[PDB]
Each structure stands twice: as C-alpha cells, then as structure tokens.
Amino acid sequence: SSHMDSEFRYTLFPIVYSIIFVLGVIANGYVLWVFARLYPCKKFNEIKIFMVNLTMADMLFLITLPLWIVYYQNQGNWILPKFLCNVAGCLFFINTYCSVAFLGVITYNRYQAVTRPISLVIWVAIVGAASYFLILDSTNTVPDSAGSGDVTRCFEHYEKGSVPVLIIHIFIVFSFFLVFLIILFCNLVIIRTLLMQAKALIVYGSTTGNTEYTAETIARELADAGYEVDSRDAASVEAGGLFEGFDLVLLGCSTWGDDSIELQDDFIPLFDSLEETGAQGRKVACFGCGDSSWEYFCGAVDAIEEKLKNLGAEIVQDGLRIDGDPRAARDDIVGWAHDVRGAIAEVKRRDLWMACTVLAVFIICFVPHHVVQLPWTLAELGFQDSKFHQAINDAHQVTLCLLSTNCVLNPVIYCFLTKKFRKHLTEKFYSMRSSR
Numbered sequence: 001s002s003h004m005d006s007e008f009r010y011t012l013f014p015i016v017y018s019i020i021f022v023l024g025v026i027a028n029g030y031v032l033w034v035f036a037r038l039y040p041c042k043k044f045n046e047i048k049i050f051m052v053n054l055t056m057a058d059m060l061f062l063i064t065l066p067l068w069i070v071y072y073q074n075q076g077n078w079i080l081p082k083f084l085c086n087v088a089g090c091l092f093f094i095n096t097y098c099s100v101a102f103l104g105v106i107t108y109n110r111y112q113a114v115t116r117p118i119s120l121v122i123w124v125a126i127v128g129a130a131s132y133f134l135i136l137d138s139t140n141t142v143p144d145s146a147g148s149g150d151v152t153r154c155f156e157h158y159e160k161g162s163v164p165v166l167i168i169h170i171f172i173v174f175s176f177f178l179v180f181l182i183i184l185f186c187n188l189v190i191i192r193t194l195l196m197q198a199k200a201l202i203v204y205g206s207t208t209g210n211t212e213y214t215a216e217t218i219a220r221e222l223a224d225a226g227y228e229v230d231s232r233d234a235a236s237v238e239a240g241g242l243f244e245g246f247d248l249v250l251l252g253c254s255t256w257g258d259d260s261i262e263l264q265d266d267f268i269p270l271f272d273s274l275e276e277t278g279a280q281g282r283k284v285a286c287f288g289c290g291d292s293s294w295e296y297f298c299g300a301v302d303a304i305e306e307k308l309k310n311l312g313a314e315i316v317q318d319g320l321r322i323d324g325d326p327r328a329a330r331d332d333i334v335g336w337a338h339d340v341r342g343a344i345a346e347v348k349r350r351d352l353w354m355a356c357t358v359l360a361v362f363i364i365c366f367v368p369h370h371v372v373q374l375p376w377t378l379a380e381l382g383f384q385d386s387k388f389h390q391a392i393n394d395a396h397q398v399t400l401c402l403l404s405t406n407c408v409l410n411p412v413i414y415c416f417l418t419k420k421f422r423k424h425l426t427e428k429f430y431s432m433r434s435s436r
C-alpha cells in the first residue's frame with residue numbers, strides 16, 4: 001500500500017550495473033596482464049598467485065551484478081531462491097567494507113612511508129558478519145506498481161520485530177566515518193609533508209678546490225630551484241647525526257693515492273663513521289672529482305656509493321664523476337643537479353597523486369552513501385515525513401550506484417600502485433611471508 005519507490009531505479013540500475021560489469025572485468029583484466037608481465041620469472045610465483053587470488057575475490061563480487069541487473073530489469077522482483085538474495089547482498093557488504101579497508105591500508109602504509117620513515121587480521125569479524133546474513137530473512141513480498149500481484153524485494157524491508165536494525169546501522173555508519181576520518185587526516189598530513197620545502201645538505205672533501213667548486217655549482221643549482229641548501233666542508237662537520245632533518249644529502253669527494261684508490265684526507269673521518277649520521281632510509285647523491293689518467297677513475301665516488309648501499313641509503317641518481325677541471329663541464333654538473341631534483345620530484349608526485357586519488361574515491365564513492373544511510377534507515381522505519389521519505393529514497397538510488405563504482409576504481413588504484421609503488425610493495429610482500 002505504502003508504495004514508496006523510485007521508478008527511475010528500474011532503468012538506472014540495469015544500465016549502470018551492466019557498464020560497471022564490463023568496465024569492472026576490463027579493469028581487473030588490465031591488472032593481471034600488467035602484473036604477470038612485470039614479474040615474468042618463477043621466483044615470483046607467490047606474489048603472482050596473490051594477485052590472482054585478489055582478482056578471483058573481485059570476480060566473486062562482479063558475478064553478483066547480473067542477479068541485480070535481472071532483479072531490477074523485472075521491476076524489483078527477486079524470482080530466484082531466497083537464499084541467493086542473502087548470498088548476493090552478503091557479498092555486496094563484504095566487497096564494500098573490504099574495498100574500504102584496502103583503500104585504508106594503502107593510505108596507512110603510504111602514511112608510514114611519507115611520514116615517520118624510521119590482533120591485526122579482521123578474519124574473525126567478517127565470519128560473524130557473514131553468518132548473520134546466512135540466517136537473515138532478506139526477502140519480503142509487496143504488490144506490483146498496479147496491484148493484485150506479489151513482487152518480492154531483496155534487502156528492501158526492515159522487520160522491526162527481531163533484528164536490531166537501528167544499532168547495527170548506527171555502529172557501521174560510525175565505523176565507516178572513523179575509517180574515513182583516519183584516511184582524511186592521513187592523506188592531508190601526506191599532502192602537507194610532501195609540499196614541505198626540501199632542505200638539502202652538501203658535504204665536500206676538497207684539497208685543490210675542485211670538489212669545492214662542484215659543491216658550489218650544485219648548491220647554486222638547488223638554491224635557484226628553491227631548496228634550503230646547507231653546503232659544508234668535511235673538516236667543519238661532525239659524524240654525530242649530521243644528516244638528521246635533511247631530505248637530500250649530497251656527498252662529494254676527490255679520489256687520491258699513488259698506490260690504491262684512497263679518499264680525500266678531510267673526508268676519510270666522515271667515511272669511517274657514516275652510520276652515525278643516519279644513512280639508512282636517507283635520500284643520498286654522490287658526486288666527485290678525479291682524472292682518467294689513473295686506473296680507478298673517480299674511485300672515491302664508487303667507494304661511498306657501494307658503502308651507502310650496504311648502509312641501505314636511497315641513491316636517487318647515478319653519481320657525478322668529473323674528469324679533471326670542473327669548470328670545463330659546468331653544464332654537465334648542473335645537468336646532474338637538475339636530474340637529482342627531477343628524480344626526487346617524481347617520488348613526491350607518486351605519493352601526491354596517490355593521496356588525492358584515495359580521497360577522490362572516498363569523497364565521490366563511499367562517503368555520499370554513508371551520509372544518506374542513517375536518514376534513509378529512519379525514514380524506512382517510519383520516523384520521518386512523506387516528502388522527505390521520497391527525497392532520501394531517490395538520493396539513495398544515486399549514492400548506491402556511485403558506491404558500486406568501487407568495482408572499476410579499486411583495480412585502477414591497484415594498477416597505479418603496481419606501476420608506481422612496485423619496489424616498495426614487492427619488498428613488503430616477501431618480508432611477511434619470510435616467517436609465516
């Protein structure tokens with residue numbers, strides 16, 4: 001009798017759900033193709049098997065969409081067995097909040113990376129949540145748009161009697177906004193710490209003044225480009241946490257020795273105690289002066305580069321090696337300082353774009369529906385006006401198909417994540433499996 005319905009949903013859902021089904025499948029397929037390509041070797045069978053198991057999960061949801069298409073096509077009538085309605089809807093819920101958790105985990109881990117670079121599994125939860133749906137009588141019958149003909153609805157009614165809808169709905173909507181708040185401030189802190197003006201430290205060891213000149217040219221290149229440059233001689237520095245509070249550290253040293261590949265006198269005290277500064281997890285660059293007449297051309301460059309690798313430092317650019325006089329190739333020196341910026345700028349752009357994306361997905365996909373839910377549930381339970389009921393029901397049709405776009409957007413995020421966070425991710429995966 002209370003025929004509260006949105007007639008546009010019977011035309012809006014079959015088209016949207018059939019577009020997000022093809023775009024969904026294509027998106028998921030483009031992930032697998034790209035991933036299986038970037039890891040062709042059998043030594044990476046476990047990272048590929050994980051990527052297959054992720055696609056399989058996404059696919060288990062994508063196969064529920066034709067049921068809804070047919071359900072809406074025949075004007076909101078669930079003809080198929082009732083237990084299938086429990087299954088279809090239960091999988092929507094599991095997919096929705098797993099898509100939320102995963103966009104949460106991407107944000108949290110990028111947060112632990114862009115900031116602070118120095119019970120857990122929810123298996124127990126989604127077991128109780130799924131077993132709740134298994135017993136839920138999701139189906140109610142109501143007469144058709146005309147009358148004298150029962151049309152079965154799937155998850156459209158709230159039986160006020162036995163199920164405590166109100167608290168379950170309040171809990172979930174608040175749990176989402178807690179998660180959204182965490183994503184919101186994690187990402188804004190990421191944007192803020194990336195947009196922070198970069199402070200660089202240049203430490204040079206020079207006898208004849210050649211490394212000193214290169215260090216000056218590099219310093220003028222970064223300062224011109226807006227860096228907080230701290231250029232200091234190796235004889236005026238102390239190994240005690242020298243690199244602390246510096247984004248980029250540029251170490252420069254001239255090669256010496258009649259016999260073997262020895263370092264510059266002022267630079268050797270720093271070399272021996274390079275751990276004490278804070279080399280691990282530090283973006284470092286290594287330039288240096290020399291001569292092609294000797295066997296180890298710029299041996300000092302190669303000496304600190306392999307030593308910083310053993311220290312686990314981030315060598316952002318291929319070390320600068322000068323043949324004789326640095327004034328002879330000032331444009332080649334500047335080129336290296338320009339490239340050094342460029343390489344650090346890309347890593348920043350990577351995380352800027354990721355933070356924006358996870359927010360744009362949250363603000364357009366998940367957030368609109370979770371705002372609409374609490375007013376809509378109350379209206380359905382009969383706690384509001386007639387005019388309002390129609391409005392909140394109509395917007396619910398729009399927000400529900402916007403929340404369904406997660407199908408296509410999460411594989412797109414996984415693609416950009418594979419394509420640009422490859423090194424970090426591959427390391428993370430094989431560290432967890434190394435014990436359990």
Ligand SMILES: CC(C)c1cc(C(C)C)c(-c2csc(N(CCN(C)C)Cc3cccnc3)n2)c(C(C)C)c1
Pocket residue numbers: 068088089090092093094096097154155156168169172173373400
């Ligand atoms: C806890 C709360 C916030 C919440 C509750 C439900 C329930 C209606 C089970 C559901 C839910 C599970 S299945 C489903 N729908 C929408 C029904 N709505 C009209 C009440 C079934 C459905 C799926 C896709 C397209 N049309 C209908 N809704 C969802 C999903 C958005 C995850 C969230």
Ligand SMILES: Cc1cc2nc3c(=O)[nH]c(=O)nc-3n(C[C@H](O)[C@H](O)[C@H](O)COP(=O)(O)O)c2cc1C
Pocket residue numbers: 205206207208209210211212254255256257258260261262264289290291292294295296297298299324325
């Ligand atoms: C005895 C001696 C040994 C040197 N050994 C090397 C060497 O092994 N490899 C190299 O590339 N340059 C070597 N050099 C060249 C210096 O690195 C070169 O003079 C440099 O351009 C000057 O840098 P500096 O003025 O900043 O100290 C050596 C020079 C001398 C005099």
